[PDB]
Amino acid sequence: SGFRKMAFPSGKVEGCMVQVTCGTTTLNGLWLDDVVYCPRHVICTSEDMLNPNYEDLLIRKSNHNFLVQAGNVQLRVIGHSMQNCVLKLKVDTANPKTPKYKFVRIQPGQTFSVLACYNGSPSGVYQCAMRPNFTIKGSFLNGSCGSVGFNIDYDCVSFCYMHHMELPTGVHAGTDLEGNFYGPFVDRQTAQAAGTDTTITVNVLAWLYAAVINGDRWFLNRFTTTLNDFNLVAMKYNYEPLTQDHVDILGPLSAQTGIAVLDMCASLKELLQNGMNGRTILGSALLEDEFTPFDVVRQCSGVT
Amino acid sequence: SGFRKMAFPSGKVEGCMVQVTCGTTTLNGLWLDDVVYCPRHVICTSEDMLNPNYEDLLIRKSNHNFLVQAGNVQLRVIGHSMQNCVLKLKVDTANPKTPKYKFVRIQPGQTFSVLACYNGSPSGVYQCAMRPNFTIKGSFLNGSCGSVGFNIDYDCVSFCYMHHMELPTGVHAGTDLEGNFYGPFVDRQTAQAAGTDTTITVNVLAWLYAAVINGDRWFLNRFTTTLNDFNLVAMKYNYEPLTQDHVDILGPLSAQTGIAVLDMCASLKELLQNGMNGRTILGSALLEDEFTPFDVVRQCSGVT
Ligand SMILES: *CC(=O)Nc1cccnc1Cl
Numbered sequence: 104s105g106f107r108k109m110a111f112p113s114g115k116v117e118g119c120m121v122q123v124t125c126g127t128t129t130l131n132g133l134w135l136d137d138v139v140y141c142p143r144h145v146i147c148t149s150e151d152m153l154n155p156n157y158e159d160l161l162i163r164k165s166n167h168n169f170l171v172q173a174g175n176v177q178l179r180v181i182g183h184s185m186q187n188c189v190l191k192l193k194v195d196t197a198n199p200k201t202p203k204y205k206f207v208r209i210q211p212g213q214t215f216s217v218l219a220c221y222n223g224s225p226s227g228v229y230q231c232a233m234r235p236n237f238t239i240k241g242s243f244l245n246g247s248c249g250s251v252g253f254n255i256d257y258d259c260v261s262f263c264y265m266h267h268m269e270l271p272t273g274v275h276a277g278t279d280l281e282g283n284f285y286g287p288f289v290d291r292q293t294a295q296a297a298g299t300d301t302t303i304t305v306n307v308l309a310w311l312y313a314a315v316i317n318g319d320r321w322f323l324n325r326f327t328t329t330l331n332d333f334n335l336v337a338m339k340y341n342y343e344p345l346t347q348d349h350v351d352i353l354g355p356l357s358a359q360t361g362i363a364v365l366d367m368c369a370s371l372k373e374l375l376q377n378g379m380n381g382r383t384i385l386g387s388a389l390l391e392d393e394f395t396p397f398d399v400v401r402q403c404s405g406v407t
Numbered sequence: 408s409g410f411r412k413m414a415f416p417s418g419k420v421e422g423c424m425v426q427v428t429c430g431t432t433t434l435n436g437l438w439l440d441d442v443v444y445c446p447r448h449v450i451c452t453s454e455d456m457l458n459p460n461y462e463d464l465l466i467r468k469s470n471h472n473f474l475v476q477a478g479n480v481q482l483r484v485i486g487h488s489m490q491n492c493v494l495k496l497k498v499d500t501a502n503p504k505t506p507k508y509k510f511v512r513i514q515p516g517q518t519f520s521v522l523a524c525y526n527g528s529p530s531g532v533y534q535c536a537m538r539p540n541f542t543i544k545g546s547f548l549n550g551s552c553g554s555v556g557f558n559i560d561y562d563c564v565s566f567c568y569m570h571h572m573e574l575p576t577g578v579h580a581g582t583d584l585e586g587n588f589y590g591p592f593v594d595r596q597t598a599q600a601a602g603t604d605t606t607i608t609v610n611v612l613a614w615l616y617a618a619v620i621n622g623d624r625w626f627l628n629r630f631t632t633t634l635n636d637f638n639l640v641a642m643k644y645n646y647e648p649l650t651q652d653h654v655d656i657l658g659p660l661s662a663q664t665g666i667a668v669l670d671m672c673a674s675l676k677e678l679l680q681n682g683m684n685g686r687t688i689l690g691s692a693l694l695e696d697e698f699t700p701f702d703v704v705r706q707c708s709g710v711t
């Protein structure tokens with residue numbers, strides 16, 4: 104019993120983290136096979152970030168200008184290219200610790216683990232979600248860029264995020280491992296404001312199911328609702344519209360608890376309208392929206 | 408910027424987890440050098456747990472009855488002994504992945520990372536605290552026993568917890584790596600109730616400092632207090648008494664923010680008396696007490 108905000112074990116990713124230095128800029132890279140992936144802004148001074156022309160800045164950079172260090176051993180750079188907002192540094196050594204891996208582009212509401220790194224060294228691991236406004240709420244200091252977000256399916260690491268940017272609102276923006284930003288964000292120090300950070304309704308319901316499974320039941324009520332009625336309330340509270348696809352995804356948790364999805368929607372409706380009244384659910388005073396239905400099933404069944 | 412509930416990178420501990428089977432009981436063991444550490448109740452049937460005589464149960468067990476599996480390779484058991492509530496299984500192979508390590512016994516209020524395992528395989532990592540009632544609020548299913556809690560100082564893993572027990576209240580009890588339970592708990596299926604789960608005051612104040620550092624300042628007020636006045640309020644709210652030792656520990660965060668510890672105590676006093684009024688601090692609607700002052704400084708300075 105118990106339900107914690109749980110990251111994937113980080114060992115497979117720890118084995119992939121290198122230090123990348125270009126001039127006075129040091130950040131992190133991801134070493135898979137004989138390629139090191141890092142944010143392209145590794146080539147920028149802070150002054151450059153105001154209005155960088157990356158193709159023009161890149162012309163002044165040679166393979167020997169990209170200093171790549173794995174532990175205390177230097178990697179030889181034999182080639183480099185820009186793909187969207189990442190650099191691919193070809194090195195002469197395949198990472199011997201390369202795990203089975205995929206590059207995946209996640210959707211808003213999907214959770215992932217972040218291995219926060221500085222100078223190619225792991226500092227910690229935490230669980231994030233791709234927010235509906237395509238930001239993430241991370242913990243990232245200067246030097247943390249090139250830290251990656253990932254899921255594990257048994258032995259295969261799916262890399263979904265590389266850290267690039269802090270908005271002035273202190274939220275985070277980054278790319279998939281093809282270097283495409285999530286959302287409308289760009290690797291330039293400009294006016295970029297996040298849109299509405301709406302609540303991931305399907306994730307809250309997953310977490311309410313996790314609460315029932317773990318004995319927290321006080322919020323179960325005598326009511327039901329419909330998708331359309333629930334959605335009128337979701338709108339008002341800046342919750343994502345609940346779709347039949349979400350209802351279908353929640354089916355296994357419905358089955359296990361014997362609580363119809365729409366009944367749990369009616370519980371969530373009362374919690375939105377009435378508040379917690381100073382009570383907690385799974386030790387939280389707000390509705391947690393960074394567990395997916397798949398996260399709940401994983402943690403409640405003990406998948407390794 | 409940003410402040411997350413952050414675990415240590417788990418790789419060094421992942422490399423230590425084995426499966427231990429005795430009869431029909433499978434749980435996890437920790438393989439360091441040529442010793443595998445596991446809960447002694449590995450020798451019990453569920454029926455035994457009602458009133459186990461461990462010395463008597465152990466007599467019926469030989470080295471060849473302890474099946475120890477690291478990945479898909481079996482380890483040869485060449486000796487076994489009971490130390491308090493753990494078994495030490497001597498194996499003929501030193502774990503080649505043994506990190507630098509210590510066994511440390513932590514105090515209530517100290518945080519640690521848990522690598523939740525099943526069948527010697529990691530499922531996830533999360534951050535816990537030794538509660539003032541010597542429980543922890545974990546996420547542990549059947550099979551999770553022998554999962555360990557740890558801190559890392561650069562390259563040295565300090566093992567502070569091994570998982571043994573779920574109380575009927577769904578909270579967790581376990582031992583240090585010498586097999587001594589935290590608190591008054593025993594490895595028997597009996598009436599054991601947790602005492603008052605008081606809030607770790609020094610940890611809340613640390614986290615309020617983390618909030619200021621990361622831009623959340625709305626709760627800063629015009630007031631101060633004294634340890635004695637604050638403590639009258641702490642008592643009423645089941646918060647741990649704040650000591651001068653705690654004030655001293657918070658000194659660096661005081662220095663960095665320029666907020667006197669006692670001023671931050673007066674902010675915490677108003678928050679206790681007045682509530683959050685539906686506001687959040689670092690995305691939390693309750694006062695977080697599972698960051699130590701050392702955790703805050705670590706995460707805010709990016710230690711690896
Ligand atoms: C994203 C990131 O870490 N960027 C950065 C900011 C300031 C200094 N160095 C770096 Cl890298």
Ligand SMILES: *CC(=O)Nc1cccnc1Cl
Nearest residue numbers: 434549550551552571572
């Ligand atoms: C502590 C733990 O994991 N114990 C347990 C309970 C039920 C079945 N197997 C085990 Cl091991």
